[PDB]
Amino acid sequence: EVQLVETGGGLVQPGGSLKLSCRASGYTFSSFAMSWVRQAPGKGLEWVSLINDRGGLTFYVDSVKGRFTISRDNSKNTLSLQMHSLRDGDTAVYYCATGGMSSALQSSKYYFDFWGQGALVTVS
């Protein structure tokens, strides 16, 4: 009964910025890596970013290295994503996912396990 709930505004003008939040429950938040994956309205799933369990290491796709910042706060069970400039091609449903990397003392994952409901980011 793992829960993941995304929050944040769904309508943005081109060239602006947007912060999404994502609250987790039902598991130890600090023990798992987290990621954001996007799905365009007419396309499939595309990975956006990943962050480590402790919150220090961040990784991104080539197209978003200078625009997106992923962060987490384990003490508030919160995953945040700050998007700058947010071009028209970034319009998508953004899902939280649990998994994608491990702490080297845990078994490997390399998969996305629990999936969140999703939030729709529309670029005007």
Partner: peptide, 19 residues
């Protein structure tokens, strides 16, 4: 590490086979 996901229309994906 070739995972597979099943996405029901109108809903979010789910994991079916990992590794």
């Amino acid at each position: 590490y070739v995972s597979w996901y099943q996405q029901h229309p109108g809903k979010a994906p789910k994991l079916m086979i990992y590794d």
